[PDB]
Amino acid sequence: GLEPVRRRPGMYTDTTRPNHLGQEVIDNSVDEALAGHAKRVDVILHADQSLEVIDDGRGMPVDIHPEEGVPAVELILCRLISVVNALSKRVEVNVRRDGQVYNIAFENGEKVQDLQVVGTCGKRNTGTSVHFWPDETFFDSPRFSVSRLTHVLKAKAVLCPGVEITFKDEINNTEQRWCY
Numbered sequence: 001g002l003e004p005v006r007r008r009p010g011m012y013t014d015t016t017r018p019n020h021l022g023q024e025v026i027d028n029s030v031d032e033a034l035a036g037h038a039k040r041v042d043v044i045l046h047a048d049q050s051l052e053v054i055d056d057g058r059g060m061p062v063d064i065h066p067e068e069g070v071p072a073v074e075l076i077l078c079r080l081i082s083v084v085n086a087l088s089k090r091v092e093v094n095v096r097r098d099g100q101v102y103n104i105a106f107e108n109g110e111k112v113q114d115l116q117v118v119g120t121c122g123k124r125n126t127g128t129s130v131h132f133w134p135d136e137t138f139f140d141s142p143r144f145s146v147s148r149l150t151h152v153l154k155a156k157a158v159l160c161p162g163v164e165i166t167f168k169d170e171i172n173n174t175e176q177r178w179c180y
């Protein structure tokens with residue numbers, strides 16, 4: 001369950017700010033890049049202080065695996081990036097795989113929208129988007145530190161030469177691009 005994360009968030013993340021939540025989502029995108037599948041990772045800091053991370057990798061698995069009765073993506077989000085889900089007022093996950101666009105959404109660590117096919121796309125159009133709204137009640141400050149995000153993303157870009165990383169800050173109206 002995710003209740004224990006909500007009871008003691010500081011046992012699971014840096015509760016100073018939601019930056020570490022951001023890093024966890026970023027790490028998963030970067031992993032797809034390191035695995036050789038993603039060529040671009042975009043991060044967007046929205047005006048409402050929610051963070052959105054998108055990669056053009058293979059897309060999180062949406063199928064139901066033998067043994068499991070629930071879509072892989074749901075397990076990934078709910079089975080203890082599940083910490084991000086636990087500590088967010090809302091999380092929206094969208095996946096492009098197999099020429100279909102899939103959506104699923106959570107609030108307060110609980111699913112509020114079943115995995116649903118909501119569109120179609122090119123066969124080569126693949127990737128994962130995670131957009132989350134941290135619950136301010138778990139953090140000393142709800143504000144993402146922009147400098148900390150930039151240090152992190154510069155660090156990831158150098159770790160993955162050839163992968164493009166972008167950061168769009170819709171609060172301060174800047175965009176940065178790295179590609180080493």
Ligand SMILES: CCNC(=O)Nc1nc2c(C(C)=O)cc(-c3cccnc3)cc2[nH]1
Pocket residue numbers: 025026028029032053054055057058059060061076128129130
């Ligand atoms: C915005 C965060 N990005 C992200 O989570 N990307 C991403 N995350 C994943 C994962 C998991 C487990 O998180 C698995 C596969 C994957 C692995 C094997 C075959 N097909 C897809 C692909 C992925 N791509």
